[PDB]
Design an enzyme around this catalytic site. Structure first.
Site, PDB file in Angstrom:
ATOM      1  N   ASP A 227      -6.691   4.320  -5.683  1.00  0.00           N
ATOM      2  CA  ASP A 227      -7.430   4.291  -4.428  1.00  0.00           C
ATOM      3  C   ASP A 227      -8.014   5.685  -4.206  1.00  0.00           C
ATOM      4  O   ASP A 227      -8.099   6.486  -5.147  1.00  0.00           O
ATOM      5  CB  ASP A 227      -6.556   3.857  -3.259  1.00  0.00           C
ATOM      6  CG  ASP A 227      -7.349   3.097  -2.199  1.00  0.00           C
ATOM      7  OD1 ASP A 227      -7.621   1.897  -2.418  1.00  0.00           O
ATOM      8  OD2 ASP A 227      -7.713   3.693  -1.162  1.00  0.00           O
TER       9      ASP A 227
ATOM     10  N   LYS B 240       0.867  -1.167   0.000  1.00  0.00           N
ATOM     11  CA  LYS B 240       0.000   0.000   0.000  1.00  0.00           C
ATOM     12  C   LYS B 240       0.908   1.221   0.000  1.00  0.00           C
ATOM     13  O   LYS B 240       2.034   1.157   0.492  1.00  0.00           O
ATOM     14  CB  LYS B 240      -0.923   0.052   1.221  1.00  0.00           C
ATOM     15  CG  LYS B 240      -2.191   0.856   0.963  1.00  0.00           C
ATOM     16  CD  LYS B 240      -3.154   0.051   0.082  1.00  0.00           C
ATOM     17  CE  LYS B 240      -4.498   0.732  -0.076  1.00  0.00           C
ATOM     18  NZ  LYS B 240      -5.530  -0.219  -0.586  1.00  0.00           N
TER      19      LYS B 240
END
Ligand SMILES: NC(=O)c1ccc[n+]([C@@H]2O[C@H](COP(=O)([O-])OP(=O)(O)OC[C@H]3O[C@@H](n4cnc5c(N)ncnc54)[C@H](OP(=O)(O)O)[C@@H]3O)[C@@H](O)[C@H]2O)c1
Ligand SMILES: NC(=O)c1ccc[n+]([C@@H]2O[C@H](COP(=O)([O-])OP(=O)(O)OC[C@H]3O[C@@H](n4cnc5c(N)ncnc54)[C@H](OP(=O)(O)O)[C@@H]3O)[C@@H](O)[C@H]2O)c1
Ligand SMILES: NC(=O)c1ccc[n+]([C@@H]2O[C@H](COP(=O)([O-])OP(=O)(O)OC[C@H]3O[C@@H](n4cnc5c(N)ncnc54)[C@H](OP(=O)(O)O)[C@@H]3O)[C@@H](O)[C@H]2O)c1
Lengths: 466, 467, 466, 97
Positions: free
Chosen positions: A181, A141
């Protein structure tokens, strides 16, 4: 097992013994990162979901603990010049948590709340969601505390180019393939792809979520909604003795991309979607929404950006209920698909749904069902398909995007859809088998936790625990 | 939405006259930057003039077009090599890496004494937009050298190829730049360069196309351009002529080389009747058409014997030869014309003959076969013209499929390659039709090929931040 | 000035306005890293020491804030197998803070207390200490929470090899040159160097602190103590109009390497070292320690690890005082050299030393003199030589080691010593000139802060603030 | 060399590096930013630079580079943007050896 000698803990354990060892692991994690509140909570929740495995063999808890430390985290200064000509400095991150099964894979978030604790918790969980897809993808991430709100297109371009100027040093088609995202959509993926291509002097699949004209894949918009329905359909077949969506009234929450395409795929399987919703309320069609009605709703949400209530102008049978959740609808409901946001389905909603006849819940959104709502469904024997498996369609198609780039071949829409369906078929079977193997039959939440963890853990030991 | 609007100075709709002036300003700017690159200036001009309908909707596309006219990277390098007499020779090598928006730079290498920067820039610039038309992820490029293969021994070409690749390997790669063959660079040169690249890089990758099937090559390479022409025309016939087909259609083919031969073969597969072939000496005519067996004999005469078309009368009693005349002169109804010989071969008078003879569609196998005045005749007569930049792109399309096979480390069967080539031509034909209908006028496939090729690059360029 | 337009704040400011701006900067640093206590304190202290600079031009406060964000931080899991055959996982760090003046330079610390906050605080200050050396060195710091205590030689070898297996990817002779620190001495430098050479297949100066047989430099053990005495010697000449160590009684605290080699260089300059100290007390020689006596003391401390009281067995003239600091000694003291630990010299100690005749203090340790002790010395007009300049001899010799490696030539001990003296000669001059320009004449503490910062800030703007 | 000026508009300039000869050492030669710059001028300066650098007795080859970028009328920040974009490509082809 060639790594047995490396681990101290071994053998079966009682529930109280497992709780003590888990508490020791949590305390060790806390001392290492005392103030990473989100990461500590994520480690706690995943560990507690793996208790059935830990009771069979305590060695898995030690493996789980060694997986809890990222292989590599890079934090870096990102200088950029805004439209007023002033130098701004933001923080960029890439958490490369685990690459056992493949290149680090995971989205990028641009938001002022972003910090290391949040990205570590999202990256840690991403390892096991990506494992569930059956594809060769690790977990990671990244992002920045850069805030897109109030920023011009040109300022987002300047920041994106500077961000990728550093990030490119640490990523690659075989190393780390980031994705979008919150705060990182089509605009940002394009700006970063252009910068990466210029610096690396190569055209490769180092980002997913790309436009189909340059390395992108079909089915990306439909991926999460389609995968949710595929997963529930296969769980109905495998666990409910040949059951199917056919003839079932399906209450859907949300009216965005996930809800829209889940409804479309429900109709393909013979189900009847009866509700849609947004923050204002829910709409209800007693005899269901058809594909033509869904197309009208899609135009209203995606073009006009209207509320669901606008749909009553186009249908005389539709009813709107303000300030209410779709779960309140007065009719028999056989299937619930929360596709709006976290904590949208609470204990009272679950008690309603059980009384209305609900047999299965599929989570399209992230963490829609509260812990108490899940307890109600479990006691009532209503199957819950966890989001970490059921909404993995998006990451699944991102893996198929990596394959298409590696193959330098754009698949047809039909081939991508068949590949996605086969992925969801194997994921559902693996969740069922893992749950049965560890003595919690029919617990798809446990089965998803076990199947995701075990493939990583066994592969990690195969590779020498490096 | 539009994320790059603020970057462009020119914007908004414009009349035809405003666009013509802006095109002149762009041309003059290009001339000032490169005053003596005659071929490149002409190439910029011709492509620009084909895009006027797009520029009329939004002048930002003209600014994008001008920005695409500057290569991302040009590498020129000295190439030292020693000939068979032991004497040192110095030649100039080039790689024009023009655009990589849609994929790695892709384009052939030319070894010829005429080669210079202006010529390679004109071929590389146009190659960006043909490669875009293939629907495959390929950029545009071109390279080569002024090295002259004529009179050189095999060993001397080997020596030059190795020194040339010694420098070129530094700037190319399977994800960066994949060169191919062209005039002066055939299988001999591709083999020599591939060996040197493999040795220096210590790798076996698809960094060149046109390779031998034994080491990374693809089937359908000889047939690619002829087959792709027929595939393209067949799809245009179905989509634009309401279910029409090659079946039953008398097809006048010009030329007797690889494009003409394999176009005839695929015409027969689709039920058409190829009635003519041609060369610089004249044309031959079969009143009831050529069979596959007859085409096979013609292929042997041209490819082995290096004979003229008149020799075919020795093998067929039905064949007739007409000296010093074009295939378009044949006295019989012609439903489809496929010029596969050379540029400007089909002039105004030939087009007027073809309309009266019943021609409904023209498919360009050669480059720019149809003169501007002939195109106007076809437009008035409602005869569809399939532009060459789309219809003859089958060769480059198969080069892309070769890259795919190398990336996949799997050699496809002849049948699989052929199906993929056919699917590429189907999507190319649909895109040309849709672009023409949206921006200029339905059925104008020439305009549609110009627009569809450019717009995929331009929109992707803006997606990527115009870097 | 070509970067003026980039900064929002500009122009002169009053002392109170600067105080408000510094508080706003501190709050920004706090929100970015809420729990990095050591780093926040380091930023606060350095910022307050630069207040005179900010008053001339507030742009320097914006530059200082941009420097407070590391260019790059890498954290990585370090797996290694201990002697019992068990897998252990530790955290590795490299904070690459700033490279404006040269490659990132800074030590590695292996100690269980190590974390990101501590390494960021040390790395940030290392930027400005290394700048003071006048050499082309940036600032950095790294290490691991690995605890060497109780570990076999083989376990340290295993950890060092695994640690460098990841670190080598981010360092290099022109990129980042680590060095020793707590827990990382010759043994660890040797193990890491062997791993780096094997992986990189190269022999370069990518580590300093190396043994002289393979790329090491002379004067490394003596550098910090010798450099302290050089710095004070030049300050005595420059600010006290031709004064010198000759004839001066020198009270030294501590009895480790810094105190030992400072005493030796004090003797070379005609000074008399009269005291040494440790946690148990201080020893005192009324007529001073000779070089032979220091050699005996060195054997007692470095071998045998004895207390200072043990020296009384070898000297009939020596006196030991338990539970007291060296500053308490009853005799005239002309120079004070605190070489033990931070905050060892408090207000009461400074008042004693002024009465005993102390004219100058030289800090061998980090921040030995408390703020109240500094207030006492200023009123008495006793010069304080700041540690960030005076104890920079160790990092200075590490730079000289890089020069020798770049030149593929080993210098004689005398040449290294000469260059070290010239560096301290230029450093002392730069500190005085900075103090004079900003109207803090004679305040060597401020002059060191300003000279170190300004070289980085001006070069940072020269380079486009990237 | 693409770069964005202070008005937010994309500008495209041409950059060059002529690496003429490295016989005696690394290519050595200046960079010129001036609207008159083109390949012919940079080749003439780079060719002569081989032999001037040779005369120094030092181990230096010959080269020359630059761009048609015109500094006149440009702000400090516009020069910074062009310089960073110019070096983004140039860095691939240069180095201390
Ligand atoms: N699509 C993916 O692949 C993907 C990826 C990551 C995460 N997700 C998760 O999936 C969920 C949304 O997916 P999406 O892509 O469909 O997002 P979206 O396009 O924004 O749609 C979300 C829908 O939920 C509704 N909603 C939000 N808050 C609500 C509330 N309190 N009550 C009722 N409805 C509410 C929104 O209506 P309003 O217009 O009133 O807000 C909207 O119709 C979120 O949990 C998100 O994090 C999906
Ligand atoms: N195959 C490809 O890869 C490819 C791809 C795109 C475009 N093209 C274009 O297609 C055309 C032909 O390609 P090809 O592979 O068939 O080449 P080829 O093997 O040389 O065949 C060309 C044919 O055209 C004839 N020809 C030349 N000038 C003529 C004239 N003035 N009048 C009548 N016939 C004439 C030649 O006969 P002579 O022997 O008498 O000259 C020969 O039979 C060229 O324009 C080429 O650039 C080829
Ligand atoms: N050497 C370098 O280049 C270097 C590098 C970085 C920092 N420093 C700083 O310099 C100082 C010492 O350096 P060093 O290498 O000489 O360290 P060292 O070898 O550990 O010596 C430190 C000396 O101070 C004494 N000490 C510690 N706490 C004391 C206290 N409360 N009262 C009296 N004596 C006390 C120790 O005695 P015990 O044995 O009883 O503790 C020891 O004799 C420290 O502040 C350190 O941070 C030096």
């Amino acid at each position: 097992d060639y790594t047995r000698s490396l681990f101290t803990l071994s053998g079966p354990a009682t529930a109280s013994e497992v709780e003590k060892h888990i508490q020791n692991a949590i305390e060790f994690v806390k001392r290492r990162d005392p103030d990473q509140v989100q990461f500590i909570q994520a480690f706690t929740e995943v560990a507690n979901g793996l208790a059935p495995v830990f009771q069979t063999d305590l060695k898995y808890l030690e493996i789980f603990l060694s997986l809890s430390e990222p292989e590599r985290v890079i934090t870096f200064k990102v200088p950029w010049v805004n439209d007023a000509g002033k130098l701004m400095i933001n923080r960029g991150f890439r958490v490369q948590f685990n690459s056992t099964l493949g290149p680090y894979k995971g989205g990028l978030r641009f938001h002022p709340s972003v910090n290391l604790s949040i990205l570590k918790f999202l990256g840690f969980e991403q390892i096991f969601k990506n494992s569930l897809t059956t594809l060769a993808m690790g977990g990671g991430k990244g992002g920045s505390d850069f805030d897109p709100k109030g920023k011009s297109d040109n300022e987002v371009r300047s920041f994106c180019q500077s961000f990728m100027t550093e990030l490119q040093r640490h990523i690659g088609p075989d190393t780390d393939v980031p994705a979008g995202d919150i705060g990182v959509g089509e605009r940002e993926i394009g700006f970063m792809y252009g910068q990466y291509k210029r610096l690396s002097n190569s055209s490769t699949g180092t980002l997913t979520g790309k436009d189909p004209k340059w390395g992108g894949s079909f089915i990306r918009p439909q991926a999460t909604g389609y995968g949710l329905v595929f997963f529930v359909q296969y769980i109905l077949n495998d666990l409910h003795n040949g059951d199917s969506f056919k003839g079932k009234r399906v209450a859907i929450s949300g009216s965005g991309n996930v809800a829209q395409y889940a409804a479309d795929k429900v109709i393909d399987f013979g189900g009847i979607p009866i509700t849609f919703s947004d923050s204002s309320g829910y709409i209800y069609e007693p005899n269901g929404f058809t594909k033509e009605m869904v197309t009208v709703l899609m135009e209203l949400k995606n073009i006009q950006r209207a509320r669901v209530s606008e749909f009553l102008k186009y249908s005389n049978t539709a009813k709107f209920f303000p300030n209410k959740k779709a779960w309140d609808v007065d009719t028999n409901v056989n299937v619930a698909l929360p596709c709006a946001c976290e904590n949208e389905l609470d204990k009272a909603d679950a008690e309603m749904l059980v009384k209305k006849g609900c047999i299965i819940v599929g989570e399209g959104a992230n963490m829609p069902t509260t812990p108490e709502a899940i307890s109600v469904f479990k006691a009532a024997k209503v199957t819950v398909c966890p989001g970490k498996a059921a909404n993995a369609g998006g990451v699944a198609v991102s893996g198929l995007e990596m394959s298409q780039n590696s193959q330098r071949e754009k698949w047809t829409s039909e081939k991508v859809l068949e590949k996605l369906q086969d992925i969801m078929k194997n994921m559902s079977k693996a969740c069922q088998e893992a749950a049965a193997k560890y003595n919690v039959h029919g617990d798809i939440i446990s089965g998803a936790n076990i199947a995701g963890f075990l493939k990583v853990a066994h592969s990690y030991c195969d590779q020498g625990c490096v």
